Write a protein that binds this ligand. Structure first.
Ligand SMILES: *[C@@H]1O[C@H](CO)[C@@H](O[C@@H]2O[C@H](CO)[C@@H](O)[C@H](O)[C@H]2NC(C)=O)[C@H](O)[C@H]1NC(C)=O
Ligand SMILES: *[C@@H]1O[C@H](CO)[C@@H](O[C@@H]2O[C@H](CO)[C@@H](O)[C@H](O)[C@H]2NC(C)=O)[C@H](O)[C@H]1NC(C)=O
Ligand SMILES: *[C@@H]1O[C@H](CO)[C@@H](O)[C@H](O)[C@H]1NC(C)=O
Ligand SMILES: *[C@@H]1O[C@H](CO)[C@@H](O)[C@H](O)[C@H]1NC(C)=O
Ligand SMILES: O=C(O)CCC(=O)C(=O)O
Ligand SMILES: O=C(O)CCC(=O)C(=O)O
Ligand SMILES: [Fe+2]
Ligand SMILES: [Fe+2]
Ligand SMILES: [Fe+2]
Ligand SMILES: [Fe+2]
Ligand SMILES: [Mn+2]
Ligand SMILES: [Mn+2]
Lengths: 691, 691
């Protein structure tokens, strides 16, 4: 029964990087004691350990485990570790891996291992101070000379190995080197801790070692082991702060519009609503497209008053996206006042107005909120890569996007929205060629630039932050290209083009009215939706005239005509039909219990009533089960005329409403007539549903 | 200027027949004076005129016109007649015709007439008494010797003709013999008198003579000339009577059913409603068909109590129609109490209950009321014949059937309904072989039997009397063959099978009700219509069961079924569709202004609700614009259950009505449900119109 207090973990680390702190946090979890050597190739490792071991030269009572710091996390307790080391019958136990290195010619000299790791790895070992001192004291070589060779040549001595009883950890009982065993390692879960199991040897290693190229694989494991994320306690390091009286850090806001993006006017307006003192935020905005110049210009006088200072970079600059992200990020670096940098792409839709706070309270170096393309799996981060630096899907990927497991995660790639510490920009990565420099995509060059400096790229799915717009095929050849975004961005299209109280009226609560017997009146369209549909209609500018036939029933003749434009003529039928299924259909089935509509409508047109031409519509029936009648402009302001009238009930809709729609049975019992418009112009949208 | 008072018309007539009285009525019209000789072949004519002329032997001041009586009517005034006779420069003027008779060998001796009638006719002449006496006194021959030869041989004497200045009326200036000139004669009209014009010679004859076979042609003319019927004064001989306190003449009513006839039960019932003292009427009824035995037997206990005496002759007698019309008519002849005989066929529908009075006040020998197959020209009389005794159309035929000209008319043929004087049966036609005797059709043999005795067959269109049923193709292979009579007899089918107050409700006056919002309730079917449709339904006895699909809409499935029988199954769809167009269609267009229905209905079925099987009908919509729902039995007497319910309006038709029908919109807004029937059986007729 060896005392866990006679054990010492030693490691070498020249600075307190993210990995060294990750290692110390796991060593503090199991109550280890770690001696950090040199907080001030590779052969300088042995030289430091050599001097440190002279203190403990004659300490037969002491066990000493030396491990790497950056590429290492711990997964077991010192008690269990000593149990396995004593169980090994070895005075000094080295780690074992799959590859002979450096000299591969020495592979023949190594003893024969039946079905296990056969070669040595000097990244981690454990032994008695006396036995370890006897070895490290043979060092007399230069700092640049390889240490892996020093131990390799000493272990490979059959007599020297026999004398000091030196063995390798062939079956990864204590040391698990990841390089060469990536398929041998899986996660073992518990209530409040996580481990790794070696499915090859059915062992639970204590030390996890991401040697060689398996760095991002260790970052993945390091999100759980030992108490990264637990099935019961959740994440154990996240916040789950700012001084009350004092102000928050000064932020540099950078907005990027590198392609034509939907609902852009809505995004700049959204920038005035972030719950952060605007006197503390400088705005930088790069617009790459002349398509968006009108939108920036509309909102720019407001941003200039809101924020502390603003600066625009326009399309006349001929700035490539990478050069602008250099300039934006480098503008913050050269200002010591810039305490935080925040890059936010136009396709990012932030529905959480405290996003900037949440990410700054998180006290990380570089961090990003999780945004997901609504109803899909595509998000602004990657869980894994390929050997080609192309997207792959990691084991816990779908788990995170669906928020089954939440926390702050070490991931290989982040995009669109992130917050970067000001000091980290100027201290650990002072270069300007962060995005530009090589043919690799700027956003990929970005994450690569931070990985190559050993900086964790964190991702927080601790809360709901926002979503990502689909800009993949945004047709800009319309007067209002957003009016066709009903399929690509259903959520955003609904917020901007559907009446706010539509939802509330649909879920009961008595908003819907019934002015005539079986005529129902509810809010449907928004005032922006009506203004843009009217404008797009008149922009086509080819209204029906004489010799125009319609699907109306008066007497026995369908001769009843109208100054209209059908959706087919402007190529908007597909979109309007989806509005019927998504929005009108549910309403009709609510108002007429027992009826089921698939929203079949072949006749969809927009009507125009002017005192010069067809100011009224004579009484007719409809070639439809039910008919939808949406008014598109204000009565008394855009026109001074009557509305609709149902003769069989002697009931008149005196004043229509700008966004409200009428719903009546068409084929019978509701003989309707359109009252004359006397001044101005009256617009309505008509749909003969269920013919 | 010859005095019209020195003129004498002489004629020979052995009895006051219908023709002699017709002749005297025209002679009294123009204020002629006529001496009737012998009120007590043909040579006895001259013998009588010879003796009469000896009185006036030396009367040079006197003009004497001799004419036939039976085949003659007058058309001019004695003043105008004498004008033309004086204008002739002839002492004795004979009539002229187209045929030489008797001896045709004498045709060569007759003088040559350029373009006119060349031969003599002793049926009418005018001359001086002295000149006429000199001729008639040469008679010494027998009564049987032909008189036409006596004058022919005397006129043909060139010297004798020269001496006495004898001429013929070649151009029909005075005498118009009809035989041979039928196309030369047309009617000339005036305000209060009618004449004839000879289009061959452009003359207006005074005397009209129906010699030879042109007897019915004279009967036709004799209906107008001189004051038979005038465009202003109308008929001048009709009634246009019975003692108040005293009783009317005893009548013998004979009803004939020689073929299966529609609406027979309705006709026997109608016999109890004739406005004639039933204590004065004996009923004879011959039923030739066993098909009608149930109908006679149903009504017979009522007839026996109503009428004075009744007698039936049934199909077990094997009586041919002619033999029964002999027996019936001959039964009255052998009873002197029978003052009038009245034969009435089953196809005759008398809508005027005073028909027997009207025809007896008319004081004719044999007379008939004008009945017409509704909406057609076929009626129970003929205006003319063919040389074959087959139907032809006379000049005034359509005029009479359409009642442009009205009166009592001398026609060649009457059928179905007529009234015959009792004395005429026993006196002028005592024979029994009136209908039977020869292969000619009994009704044709009948009129022929009265024509050959010189009896006028009168016809009265002075009022509206009735109509004639179409028995031509009466399918008797049904439980109630009359239910299929909607096309053949529309008027009668409506009286018996359409609710009495349907018409009144359709012409406003607020009978129709509206128990739920757009559900209208009106009377449609009669209680006899419902009882017979129900009975015919259950008589088919093959109701829908399991695996039965219907055209109802509940949720998204048309699985809603019913214990029904469609009209197609019993072969009644054609008939029910006509009811929809004729009766339902007009009502729907009245209740829903602006709607136009051609009564399109593909689904027409009768429903049955029993407590053992499908007592209710779950909520469904309809595959129809509007739906017709007629209840067919009494609630509370034939069943004790609920009716219809409209869920969207929370309105319930608690109690349906036996003949009333419901009308609601089907496709929407009226989710309906059939309430459970708890006792008995509930029947409804459903029609999904306008799908
Ligand atoms: C949606 O409903 C809300 C609340 O019912 C409406 O808010 C009101 O707006 C009117 C002006 O339109 C004000 O006079 C009231 O004081 C508001 N009431 C509340 C409780 O805020 C809102 O206007 C409706 N939406 C639209 C487009 O009219
Ligand atoms: C058709 O309408 C008449 C008059 O509105 C109905 O006649 C009445 O009949 C009820 C019994 O059903 C009597 O109580 C009333 O006294 C009658 N009124 C008159 C003015 O005669 C007649 O019943 C209706 N037809 C049917 C089949 O009900
Ligand atoms: C570490 O030591 C403290 C006592 O100082 C003890 O309370 C805690 O439970 C220990 N943690 C572990 C994981 O052993
Ligand atoms: C016949 O004579 C009477 C006088 O007796 C006269 O009133 C009547 O008008 C005459 N009728 C005709 C048709 O001449
Ligand atoms: O509101 C109106 O103008 C009448 C609506 C109508 O019934 C039609 O479109 O024909
Ligand atoms: O009156 C009834 O029984 C219900 C009528 C109806 O809606 C149906 O036939 O389905
Ligand atoms: Fe149109
Ligand atoms: Fe309409
Ligand atoms: Fe059916
Ligand atoms: Fe129905
Ligand atoms: Mn390492
Ligand atoms: Mn004659």
């Amino acid at each position: 029964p060896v005392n866990p207090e006679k054990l010492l973990v030693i490691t070498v680390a020249t600075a307190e990087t993210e990995g060294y702190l990750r290692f110390l946090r796991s060593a503090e979890f199991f109550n280890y004691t770690v001696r950090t050597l040199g907080l001030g190739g590779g052969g300088q490792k042995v030289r430091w350990l050599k001097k440190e071991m002279e203190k403990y030269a004659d300490r037969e009572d002491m066990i000493i485990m030396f491990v790497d710091s950056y590429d290492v996390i711990l997964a077991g307790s010192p008690t269990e570790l000593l149990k396995k080391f004593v169980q090994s019958g070895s005075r000094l136990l080295f780690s074992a891996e799959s590859f002979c290195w450096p000299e591969w010619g020495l592979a023949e000299q190594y003893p024969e291992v039946g079905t296990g790791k056969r070669f040595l790895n000097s990244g981690g070992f454990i032994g008695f101070a006396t036995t370890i001192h006897q070895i490290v004291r043979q060092w007399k070589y230069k700092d640049d000379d390889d240490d892996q060779l020093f131990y390799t040549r000493l272990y490979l001595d059959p007599g020297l190995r026999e004398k000091l009883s030196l063995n390798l950890d062939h079956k990864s009982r204590i040391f698990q080197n990841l390089n060469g065993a990536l398929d041998e390692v899986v996660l073992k879960f518990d209530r409040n801790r996580v481990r790794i199991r070696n499915v090859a040897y059915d062992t639970l290693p204590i030390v996890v070692h991401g040697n060689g190229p398996t760095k991002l694989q260790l970052n993945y494991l390091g999100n759980y082991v030992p108490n990264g994320w637990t099935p019961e306690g959740g994440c154990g390091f996240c916040n789950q702060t700012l001084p009350g009286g004092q102000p928050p850090p000064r932020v540099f806001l950078a907005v990027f519009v590198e392609q034509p993006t939907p609902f852009l006017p809505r995004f700049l307006q959204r920038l005035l609503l972030l719950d952060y003192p605007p006197d503390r935020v400088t705005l930088f905005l790069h617009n790459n497209e002349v398509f968006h110049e009108p939108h920036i210009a509309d909102s720019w006088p407001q941003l200039q008053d809101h924020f502390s200072a603003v600066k625009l970079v326009g399309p006349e600059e001929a700035l490539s996206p990478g050069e602008a992200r250099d300039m934006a990020m480098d503008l913050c670096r050269q200002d010591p006042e810039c305490e935080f940098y925040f890059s936010l792409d136009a396709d990012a839709v932030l529905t959480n107005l405290q996003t900037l706070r949440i990410l700054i309270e998180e006290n990380r170096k570089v961090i990003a909120p999780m945004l997901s393309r609504h109803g899909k799996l595509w998000s602004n981060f990657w869980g894994a890569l390929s050997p080609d630096e192309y997207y792959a899907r990691s084991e816990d990927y779908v788990e995170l996007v669906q928020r089954k497991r939440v926390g702050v995660w070490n991931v290989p790639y982040i995009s669109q929205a992130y917050v970067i510490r000001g000091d980290t920009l100027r201290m650990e990565l002072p270069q300007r060629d962060v995005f530009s420099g090589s043919d690799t995509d700027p956003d990929m060059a970005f994450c690569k630039s931070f990985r190559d400096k050993g900086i964790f790229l964190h991702l927080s799915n601790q809360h709901e932050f926002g979503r990502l717009l689909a800009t993949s095929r945004y047709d800009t050849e319309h007067l209002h290209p957003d009016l066709w975004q009903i399929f690509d961005n259903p959520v955003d299209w609904k917020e901007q083009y559907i009446h706010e109280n539509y939802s509330r009226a649909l879920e009961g609560e008595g908003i819907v009215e019934q002015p005539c017997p079986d005529v129902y009146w509810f809010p449907l369209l928004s005032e922006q939706m009506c203004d843009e549909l009217v404008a797009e209609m008149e922009h086509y500018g080819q209204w029906s005239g004489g010799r125009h036939e319609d699907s109306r029933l008066a007497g026995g003749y369908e001769n009843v005509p109208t100054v209209d434009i059908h959706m087919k003529q402007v190529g908007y039928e597909d979109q309007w039909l989806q509005l019927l299924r998504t929005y009108v259909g549910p309403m009709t089935e609510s108002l007429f219990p027992g009826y089921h509509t698939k929203a079949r409508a072949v006749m969809n047109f927009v009507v125009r009533y002017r005192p010069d031409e067809q100011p009224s519509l004579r009484p007719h029936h409809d070639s439809s089960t039910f008919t939808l009648n949406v008014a598109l402009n204000h009565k008394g302001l855009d026109y001074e005329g009557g509305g609709c009238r149902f003769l069989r009930y002697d009931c008149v809709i005196s004043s229509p409403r700008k966004g409200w729609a009428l719903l009546h049975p068409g084929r019978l019992t509701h003989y309707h007539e359109g009252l004359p418009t006397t001044w101005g112009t009256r617009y309505i949208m008509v749909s003969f549903v269920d013919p």
